[PDB]
Design a protein around this nucleic acid. Structure first.
Lengths: 105, 246, 60, 50, 72
RNA sequence: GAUUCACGCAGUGUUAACGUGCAAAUUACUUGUCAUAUUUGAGUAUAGGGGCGAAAGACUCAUCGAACUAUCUAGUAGCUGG
RNA sequence: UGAAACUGUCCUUAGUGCAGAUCUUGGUGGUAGUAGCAAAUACUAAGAAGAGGAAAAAAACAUCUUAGAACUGAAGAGGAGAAAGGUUCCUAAACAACAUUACUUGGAUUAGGGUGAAUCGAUCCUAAAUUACAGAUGGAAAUCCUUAAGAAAAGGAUUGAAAGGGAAUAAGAUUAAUAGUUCUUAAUCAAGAGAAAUGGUAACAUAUCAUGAACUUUAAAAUGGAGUGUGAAAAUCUACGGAAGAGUUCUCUUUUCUUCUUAACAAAAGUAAAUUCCACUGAAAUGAAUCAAUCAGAGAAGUGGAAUUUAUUGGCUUUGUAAGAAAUUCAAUGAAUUGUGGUAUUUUUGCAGUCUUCAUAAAAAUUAAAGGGAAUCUUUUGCUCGUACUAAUAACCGCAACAGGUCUCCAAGAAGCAAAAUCUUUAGUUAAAUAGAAUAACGCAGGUAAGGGAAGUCGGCAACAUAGCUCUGUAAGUUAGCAAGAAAGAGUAGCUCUGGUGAUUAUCGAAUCAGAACUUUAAAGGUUAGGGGAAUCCGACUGUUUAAUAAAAACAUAGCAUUCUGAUAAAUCUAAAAGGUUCAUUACAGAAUGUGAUUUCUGCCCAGUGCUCUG
RNA sequence: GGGAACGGGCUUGAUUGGAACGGCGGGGAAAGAAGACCCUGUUGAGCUUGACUCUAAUUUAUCAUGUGAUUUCACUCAUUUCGUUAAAUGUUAAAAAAACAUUAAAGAAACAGGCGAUUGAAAGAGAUAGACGGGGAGUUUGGCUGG
RNA sequence: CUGUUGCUUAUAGACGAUGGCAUCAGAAAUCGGUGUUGUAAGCUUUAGAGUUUCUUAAUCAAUACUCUCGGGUAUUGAAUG
RNA sequence: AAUAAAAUAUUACUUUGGAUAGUUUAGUUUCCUGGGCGAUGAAGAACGCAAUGAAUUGCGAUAAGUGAUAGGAACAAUAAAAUGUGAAUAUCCAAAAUUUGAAUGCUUGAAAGUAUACUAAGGUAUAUAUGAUAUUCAAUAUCCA
């Protein structure tokens, strides 16, 4: 039952002041500063969390590999696979429907 | 005597509007050529809850007709609108629910809301939840139309005043009886600091004109003139009638 | 360990000690005392012996 | 406090400097009436209002 | 509890030292100095405060650059 | 915006202690309350015929049926003392 | 006595004669060696230093070490911070004054010493709000405006948080005192310098890889609370196998106790829980599923995959770090070891759906991606400021070493429903406004009592009494929810047993329930722990109130009702103002009032005074 | 006993040894406080009101010269109130689909002396004059008197 | 002669005072009497419901039998020596 | 009836206290002369500098003082050094003059800071209003080709 103390000068249990107590040599328990939980990317159309992109802080994506922050697809990384399939059908079917309605139908 | 609580309200120190989480200003987009001689199409992206008001607000996203990019407005939801809907605004718009047309194009008996009291001011009349205004008649001689205000009064407006077809959502809001003082406390979470109202007769003569003596009463008529100075104007002002109605 | 003017930074102290005594400095830590004097902890390169500089200056 | 501005600490340090007494050699000057420093204070006796 | 007990929570400064007069009279929330009349360019002096005039005025300081001018 | 216990909080009773006190309002038991009309830190806003008040003329630095401070001012006294 | 100025007479001049003014200032008596130095369980023995325990017991003796006995009892009298304090921190000399005795002690005197950052914060961003040039207003000081008025600022100025957002550091050791700051070791971050890809059907995946300008969009930073289930770690408890040391040992005890550890950052043997998608196929005799739910032909269950989260890489074990550290022992610097589990509790931390709102629960700095197609490993540096100490029954505010007040973090065992009362462990302390003797009255605090039982008294004021859990049982009245723990009755201990509630194919594990003999001092009661009933009045209820004599029937409240207003309005602040508040508003709204839940009912009067009129 | 009508001191008597300890609560008309109940001041303050005298806000009439036919009309030209990225004003020529829309190939009409509406010579501010005006300011509320 | 002082003095007592003894002073244990409570610790009664474990020995087991009218306390404001 | 411990009375000496007497480098009033500040940075505030200084005094990174001119042998609490080849002392002089302050590149809470141009560091300039001149512009505002 080793009781610990805050290492930094913050004395209040705010969200940015998260701590985890880990063990060390001789039964010593120290204080670790744990990070905050961050949300992931969402499809711009349906607002669903995309798959294949991690949930980390915005600056941490700079440290990520260039291929580990986006999905190799048209509108990948900003739209779900369903968000894009409807886009293709909308872009194609509407173009075909008016190709026979006007201009000397 | 002191200054009555009504006088202290015009100062605006603790009686300011608690508008921090409010979404913005709900009004029509600025009138231009495309809203005067053509139609623009808007896409209802989402419907949200604006604190301090009983009606939902819709985030409509019009494309910019003159430049490249979007143009995001904040309309008031007519009852029936849904996400992903297309709404058309202009002098040639279809007469569907949610479309915005000049008040001079709607036929007689059409129900509209968010009416402009002057062309280009983007919404004055019929804005509360469940409210609407009806079109009474047209006068093509001076291009003016008559509409019936939700209070029952009749008004004359120019035919160029835009309006949104339908009724405002969130109807029947006030039909639910508040049960607890806590529920009334939470009603003004995004409103002024006016809820717990102390009766004037319960105060002292310094604070209020009704501050009574050994028996809680008024002692003088509570129907006053409109010309009464601030501080003594309390109760009923320019009242033509009183009592209960049979 | 030195006492320097407060209006000098770690960069100017590092050059000043290098020029004044002809030594190599790899680390400087400074604290400003309550009276107003800035105390500088100057660490020399491992090749240069600090004990000989102290005797040369006059500390020994 | 543990945290203080740079100017505030220097004015704190001067208050430490001025909390001293007359040196012995000064008291031995001819025609000397200065034996004590009447501008003296102690942390538990008087707060310096700063 | 308006006497001894209510004094326990007094640990928030209202006035700090001012830059133009050096007194602890700079109001933090009002952003003005009660004594020397800060950012207001004119020094704060009043006829009813005649003693306040004889405590800080010309001749109460070193007079570094005016002692020579009048002597000259 | 149910019933209670606990960390805390208040102040119903003893009209107990104390009453040149631990204290210019505190202590002990008892009682009530002990999370949504809740408790609380910091920042910030509101100033004297003004502010703030779930309203007691309550609170506004131990000062309130009109704060503190300086000037008019050695205010006036058919009244009291010398 | 005193050691350098002074006196008498006449005129002149006046700040010219004191017993009083609750007179002003200063000094001093009786009271008086009197009242007091009585909250916070507590000290004793030996030794050392010291002038400072002597003596006809002068019954007491400050400080330090050891031993005994103890208290705070881990929501602490423990270990650390924010504000406030400002050198109070450490050491040495020294004790005139101060800490209601004394002091060798001290937060007290004297003199030195002490606060080390690329990674912790300020610095950076904006929130409520705040302040400038030009402009508007004013007799005036000055006020208004904060992007509207401007030839000012691709777009909107300044400040505003050491608890909001935020690039990057950990372990061990060291000092009389500093340490995510120094030393060793091990990392991390930023700014530099030296026609343009594959794979998978797909969800999607590739040590930087695999070009991507203007312009635009999206996402992140970035968002309430409750309650339920569960993954993981830590703490506690426990099973198995030992190693080392300690305690007990005349009565036993294969016994009781202590240690058996591991960081940042990365790696990928082995292997989890939950959610969402993808491919095959097409569900009815409808299935699938949770504690609850909930889902399906715009497609279920089944099989096979993909992705994300799980306190750093990738959650857990494991690995590099790294045993060389550290811990426990042994010897005189050198040697020994450092398995594996659990269908237990708590805390922390995420996740999954459910409920709730006339409440919907911030923004910017900064970053990434997309649409688009313009153009053709090594090494260097990382500046300024804060950093000591208390954070309180002695460092803060109250005149003080004041029983008052002041925001937080970490948190063991027993017992119990319980973070309750009570006792103990690690840590801290034995002093915190003086003691000894005697054991009078009157007191303050805690008690008991024969017989009676409110006869006392304004008044059951004060005290007594009931009290946990289980089973039975429970009235009138009622807004049909309650009253209700109504009221009332029975049981409860110890020892020895029996049975029920599961997992895996006989073993393994959990406290919980029920039952039966036997025994006794016949069992909730050491602590904790509701007195009950029958009515009347007021307020409907939860709530607030005269800080310091009134906590209530007073205020508030939801409900009911009335009045004005189409917004250039109504109310209303300002001397004025392209001024200000409700108003980021628009009659289901704003403003001004009376009554006070629900049920029932609101009677008659317009003469008078108000208010109003389309007259 | 008398006395200011309830003496510790005075008069006449009763009676007295100097210093005091622990109690207690009769007295010292005990201490604390220039009575707070009552009255008198040609002393005040809060509050109320058709008390007297006034005042902010409100309101009404006249004045302050926009043009063309005191009132009635039409216009805009000061003025009122608004809207924007002052982003197509005026006159001629000519609801099936929550997707994209930009940096042009080889085009995208001209002119008005008005940025767009709105109000409009009316309203608002100023001067003078009447009304209203406890919202507010100043002041007053005689004397004699078996209190 | 008297007082202080001693018996941590009593028939007394807030403190003084008062009462007793002071070398045959006094105090102390121990011993016996006299009281209070209720049968001590150790081994035995298979006391003993029962479960274990040999196999019909043991072990554990509230409570209960003998030693036991036991053990403990007893002036401190008791009484002999 | 009795003693004087206490109580009271006078004198002398001592004590606590600081009246009285003597004294003044301090004030008050009147009068005479001036009434001489600052963007060439004032008054005011802060910090710092003496061989041993805490205050005060003087001074400003050239620090209880530098140069020049007069001045002639000191200072002192204790040491040192320098000194008629010039010690103290004096001045309408010269050089120098930290952070701020009307404070003025921008910000300023107790804020540490920071942008550009000129001559890594250091030093200057850059606020608002404003008069004159030069220069670059804007407006079909009036004409005019």
């Amino acid at each position: 039952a080793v009781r610990v103390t805050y290492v930094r000068k913050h004395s209040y249990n705010t969200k940015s002041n998260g701590i985890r107590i880990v063990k060390t040599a001789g039964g010593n328990m120290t204080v670790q500063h744990r990070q905050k939980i961050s949300n992931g990317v969402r499809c711009g159309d349906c607002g669903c969390v995309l798959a294949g992109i991690r949930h980390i802080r915005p600056h941490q994506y700079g440290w990520l590999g260039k291929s580990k922050r986006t999905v190799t697809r048209a509108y990948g990384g900003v739209k779900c696979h369903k968000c894009v399939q409807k886009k293709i059908l909308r872009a194609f079917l509407i173009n075909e429907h008016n190709l026979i309605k006007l201009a000397a139908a | 005597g002191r200054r009555t609580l009504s006088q202290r309200k015009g100062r605006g120190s603790i009686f300011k509007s608690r508008s921090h989480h409010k979404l913005g200003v709900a009004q029509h987009r600025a009138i231009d050529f495309f809203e005067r001689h053509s139609t623009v199409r808007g896409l209802v992206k989402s419907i949200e809850h604006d604190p301090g008001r009983g009606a939902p607000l819709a985030r409509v996203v019009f494309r910019n007709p003159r430049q490249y990019g979007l143009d995001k407005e904040l309309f008031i939801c007519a009852e029936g609108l849904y996400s992903g809907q297309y709404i058309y605004c202009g002098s040639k718009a279809s007469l569907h629910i949610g479309n915005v047309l000049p008040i001079g194009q709607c036929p007689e008996g059409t129900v509209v809301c968010n009416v402009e009291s002057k062309p280009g001011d983007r919404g004055i009349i019929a804005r509360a939840s469940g409210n609407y205004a009806t079109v009474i008649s047209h006068n093509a001689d001076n291009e003016t139309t008559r509409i019936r205000l939700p209070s029952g009064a009749k008004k004359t407006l120019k035919s160029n005043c835009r309006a949104m077809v339908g009724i405002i959502a969130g109807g029947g809001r006030t039909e639910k009886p508040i049960l607890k003082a806590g529920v009334a406390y939470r009603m003004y979470k995004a409103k002024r600091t006016t809820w717990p109202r102390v009766r004037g007769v319960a105060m002292n003569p310094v604070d209020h004109p009704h501050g009574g003596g050994n028996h809680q009463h008024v002692g003088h008529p509570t129907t006053l003139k409109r010309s009464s100075p601030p501080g003594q104007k309390a109760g009923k002002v320019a009242a033509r009638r009183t009592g209960l109605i049979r | 360990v030195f006492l320097c003017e407060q209006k000098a930074n770690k960069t100017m102290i590092k050059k000043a000690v290098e020029k004044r005594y002809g030594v190599k400095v790899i680390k400087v830590n400074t604290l400003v005392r309550l009276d107003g004097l800035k105390k500088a902890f100057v660490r020399l390169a491992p090749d240069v012996e600090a004990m000989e500089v102290a005797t040369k200056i006059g500390l020994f | 406090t543990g945290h203080k501005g740079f100017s505030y600490k220097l004015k704190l340090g001067k208050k430490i400097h001025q909390n001293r007494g007359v040196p012995q050699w000064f008291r031995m000057k001819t025609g000397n009436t200065i034996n004590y420093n009447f501008k003296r204070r102690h942390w538990n006796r008087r707060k310096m209002g700063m | 509890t308006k006497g001894t007990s209510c004094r326990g929570t007094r640990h928030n400064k209202t006035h700090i030292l001012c830059k133009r007069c050096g007194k602890r009279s700079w109001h933090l929330q009002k952003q003005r100095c009660a004594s020397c009349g800060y950012p207001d360019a004119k020094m704060r002096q009043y006829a009813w405060g005649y003693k306040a005039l004889r405590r800080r005025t010309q001749g109460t300081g070193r007079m570094r650059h005016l002692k020579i001018a009048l002597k000259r």
